[PDB]
Amino acid sequence: GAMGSMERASLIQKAKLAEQAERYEDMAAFMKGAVEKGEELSCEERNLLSVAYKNVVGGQRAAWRVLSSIEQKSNEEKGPEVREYREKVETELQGVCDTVLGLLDSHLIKEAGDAESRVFYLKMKGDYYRYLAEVATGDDKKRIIDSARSAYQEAMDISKKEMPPTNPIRLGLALNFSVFHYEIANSPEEAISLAKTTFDEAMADLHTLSEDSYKDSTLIMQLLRDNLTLWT
């Protein structure tokens, strides 16, 4: 595409430079160009793709929430401007989510055979459908929610068969699926049950880990505990 004339390795190098420079839109464009070269992504390259788009869509979500709050307050006649601008931000956010989903569907997921890559991409698919669900209201809010759930469920099924309960991708998948249950699917009890079971099963497997792996796993376990403290 737009990055079609740049070498794959140069796109990856520039994505790392863009991360250092906090230029996340650039980072995401470089990583989109790298994916579109058609080769599978290494573990590090998958992380670059996820960091880039998470930062882009995170800024959009924060802006959408500010604007949605102002719009809800307004409903003196403020004119159409708050709604128009919230809609503009919403459409941009939806476009980024559709771009990420399109990369996953063409063709990252279908070529991902190892558990670490397939779970990673299916978790991303659940996440970006979840961000679509956050702004959805029309006749597809239900279908968007089901698409998020289905992606997270397939990732969970693979992760429980193929990864130890302390694996950081397995833990982060469970964390985010529990947030889906709490915030999107109106299932707080399922959120709490999943977070508790995930935490307890990880605790019981920590004895198998090196010092560095222990640090990685316990960091995500603390996020599960932080949510449980907020929810109970």
Binding site: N47, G172, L175, N176
Partner: peptide, 9 residues
Amino acid sequence: AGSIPGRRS
């Protein structure tokens, strides 16, 4: 509450 922050490689 909080999902994976995920904003730093």
